[PDB]
Design an enzyme around this catalytic site. Structure first.
Site, short mmCIF file in Angstrom:
data_model
loop_
_atom_site.label_atom_id
_atom_site.label_comp_id
_atom_site.label_asym_id
_atom_site.label_seq_id
_atom_site.Cartn_x
_atom_site.Cartn_y
_atom_site.Cartn_z
N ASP A 182 10.53 -4.74 6.40
CA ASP A 182 11.22 -3.98 7.40
C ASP A 182 12.21 -5.09 8.18
O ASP A 182 13.34 -4.71 8.36
CB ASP A 182 10.13 -3.83 8.80
CG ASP A 182 9.14 -2.92 8.55
OD1 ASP A 182 9.43 -1.66 7.76
OD2 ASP A 182 7.92 -3.00 8.59
N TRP B 233 3.59 0.63 13.65
CA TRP B 233 4.87 0.06 13.98
C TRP B 233 5.30 0.52 15.27
O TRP B 233 6.13 -0.48 16.03
CB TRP B 233 5.87 0.68 13.01
CG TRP B 233 5.70 -0.05 11.55
CD1 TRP B 233 6.42 -0.98 10.90
CD2 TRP B 233 4.94 0.35 10.59
NE1 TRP B 233 6.17 -1.39 9.70
CE2 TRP B 233 5.08 -0.37 9.66
CE3 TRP B 233 3.92 1.61 10.31
CZ2 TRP B 233 4.56 -0.33 8.31
CZ3 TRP B 233 3.23 1.40 9.27
CH2 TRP B 233 3.54 0.69 8.22
N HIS C 118 4.93 7.92 -1.77
CA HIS C 118 4.54 7.35 -3.09
C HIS C 118 4.37 8.18 -4.32
O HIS C 118 4.38 7.78 -5.58
CB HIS C 118 3.02 6.73 -3.02
CG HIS C 118 3.10 5.28 -2.15
ND1 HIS C 118 2.09 4.60 -2.02
CD2 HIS C 118 4.09 4.89 -1.35
CE1 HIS C 118 2.39 3.56 -1.24
NE2 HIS C 118 3.61 3.70 -0.78
N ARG D 45 2.99 9.31 3.62
CA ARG D 45 2.86 8.36 2.56
C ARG D 45 2.51 8.88 1.17
O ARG D 45 3.20 8.43 0.09
CB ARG D 45 1.97 7.35 2.90
CG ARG D 45 1.64 6.09 2.00
CD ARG D 45 0.54 5.15 2.77
NE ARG D 45 0.13 4.19 1.58
CZ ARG D 45 -1.07 3.82 1.19
NH1 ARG D 45 -2.04 4.39 1.74
NH2 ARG D 45 -0.98 2.91 0.32
N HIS E 193 8.38 4.58 9.06
CA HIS E 193 7.24 3.88 9.62
C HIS E 193 7.12 4.18 11.00
O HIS E 193 6.35 3.67 11.72
CB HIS E 193 7.65 2.48 9.16
CG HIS E 193 7.12 2.02 7.73
ND1 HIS E 193 7.73 0.63 7.39
CD2 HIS E 193 6.49 2.49 6.94
CE1 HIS E 193 7.22 0.67 5.88
NE2 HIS E 193 6.44 1.86 5.85
C1 HEM Z 1 10.97 0.16 2.36
C2 HEM Z 1 9.91 -0.37 1.57
C3 HEM Z 1 8.72 0.17 2.15
C4 HEM Z 1 7.59 -0.54 2.12
C5 HEM Z 1 7.61 -2.30 1.47
C6 HEM Z 1 6.34 0.11 2.53
C7 HEM Z 1 5.15 -0.50 2.68
C8 HEM Z 1 4.09 0.10 3.43
C9 HEM Z 1 2.89 -0.39 3.65
C10 HEM Z 1 2.42 -2.02 3.38
C11 HEM Z 1 2.00 0.35 4.28
C12 HEM Z 1 0.62 0.11 4.88
C13 HEM Z 1 -0.39 0.99 3.91
C14 HEM Z 1 -1.74 0.75 4.56
O1 HEM Z 1 -2.32 -0.55 4.71
O2 HEM Z 1 -2.35 1.57 5.11
C15 HEM Z 1 2.79 1.54 4.60
C16 HEM Z 1 2.37 2.43 5.29
C17 HEM Z 1 3.30 3.64 5.26
N1 HEM Z 1 4.48 3.93 5.03
FE1 HEM Z 1 5.63 2.61 4.14
N2 HEM Z 1 6.75 1.32 2.94
C18 HEM Z 1 8.13 1.53 2.64
C19 HEM Z 1 8.76 2.47 2.67
C20 HEM Z 1 8.40 3.75 3.11
C21 HEM Z 1 8.96 5.11 3.07
C22 HEM Z 1 10.54 5.25 2.49
C23 HEM Z 1 8.38 6.12 3.76
C24 HEM Z 1 8.53 7.40 3.89
C25 HEM Z 1 9.82 7.79 4.28
C26 HEM Z 1 7.08 5.28 4.24
C27 HEM Z 1 6.20 5.69 5.10
C28 HEM Z 1 4.87 5.11 5.38
C29 HEM Z 1 4.01 5.80 6.15
C30 HEM Z 1 4.14 7.12 7.20
C31 HEM Z 1 2.86 4.64 6.33
C32 HEM Z 1 1.57 5.01 7.13
C33 HEM Z 1 0.56 5.48 6.57
C34 HEM Z 1 -0.88 5.79 7.34
O3 HEM Z 1 -0.59 5.79 8.59
O4 HEM Z 1 -1.86 5.87 6.83
N3 HEM Z 1 6.95 3.83 3.78
N4 HEM Z 1 4.06 1.28 3.91
#
Ligand code: HEM
Length: 249
Positions: A207, A178, A41, A37, A162
């Site tokens: 998603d 997820w 970001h 993440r 995810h």
């Molecule tokens: C497609 C649009 C995307 C949206 C709307 C989105 C949104 C989110 C949201 C709302 C969270 C939760 C944050 C939290 O509350 O801790 C999250 C976590 C995460 N996102 Fe996405 N994301 C997107 C794309 C991506 C991409 C492109 C990647 C990497 C290739 C990614 C990797 C992750 C990972 C690994 C987490 C888990 C973080 C943790 O476990 O602390 N996301 N994302």
């Protein structure tokens, strides 16, 4: 379209040594999802039209950490600071993208090619470029396509990130993983997306947008059926993401 810069032998030595140290650290600390993440970001702020934002070290700036989309990423930055200090020659820009690459690897994902040489830039991008989890396909295209310059394929493959980690109600407000195996990088994100909502597992509106879009849906189906194809397309997209604005861009 990339022409990667030359870096010195000592720089490449440090990349290799940092990669190893990152594996051990990330595996021990169970923070691969958070580091993925952090890299995402960092990179996902790139705007192709203005050549602003992208993976240039700015996420460590208090101003960028304060962006709401980045809630929780201050933990990531703090966690890496001691290790980073062992590799003074490396840019933060490279270090964070390398941590992202290592996060995918150590959870069993593809080996995403990594090229060094990103410079740390002084000015963080404006807030609001990262995607909004409550929106859908048009929004995803505006952010990944019109801004970052990635493809529809890249959008679906990258959503697969995810497959590791979870949301937290104190960070985004969403809550839970997820997948049943949130520290394992595999195609389960897509399998779960197809099977419907299972108790305990998370699906954001962003998603779910993949399922109903005529271009995204066949990709979801492909990845759910063929983890190898997912890994190939994922590795391509993550490399591109990690290189936005870098080495021509
Ligand atoms: C497609 C649009 C995307 C949206 C709307 C989105 C949104 C989110 C949201 C709302 C969270 C939760 C944050 C939290 O509350 O801790 C999250 C976590 C995460 N996102 Fe996405 N994301 C997107 C794309 C991506 C991409 C492109 C990647 C990497 C290739 C990614 C990797 C992750 C990972 C690994 C987490 C888990 C973080 C943790 O476990 O602390 N996301 N994302």
């Amino acid at each position: 379209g990339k022409s990667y810069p030359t870096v010195s032998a000592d720089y490449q030595k440090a990349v290799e040594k940092a990669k190893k140290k990152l594996r051990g650290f990330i595996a021990e600390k169970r923070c691969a999802p958070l580091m993925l993440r952090l890299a995402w970001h960092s990179a996902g702020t790139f705007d192709k039209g203005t050549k602003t934002g992208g993976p240039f070290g700015t996420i460590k700036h208090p101003a960028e950490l304060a962006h709401s989309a980045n809630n929780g990423l201050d933990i990531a930055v703090r966690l890496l600071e001691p290790l980073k200090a062992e590799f003074p020659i490396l840019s933060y820009a490279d270090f964070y993208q390398l941590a992202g690459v290592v996060a995918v690897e150590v959870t069993g994902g593809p080996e995403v090619p990594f090229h060094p040489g990103r410079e740390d830039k002084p000015e963080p991008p404006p807030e609001g470029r990262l995607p909004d989890a409550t929106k859908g396909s048009d929004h995803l295209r505006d952010v990944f396509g019109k801004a970052m310059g990635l493809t529809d394929q890249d959008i679906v493959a990258l959503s697969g990130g995810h497959t590791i980690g979870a949301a937290h109600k104190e960070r985004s407000g969403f809550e839970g993983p997820w997948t049943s195996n949130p520290l394992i990088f595999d195609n389960s994100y897509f399998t779960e997306l197809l099977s419907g909502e299972k108790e305990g597992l998370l699906q954001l509106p962003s998603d779910k947008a993949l399922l109903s879009d005529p271009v995204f849906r066949p990709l979801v189906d492909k990845y759910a059926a063929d983890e190898d194809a997912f890994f190939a397309d994922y590795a391509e997209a993550h490399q591109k993401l990690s290189e936005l604005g870098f080495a021509d861009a």
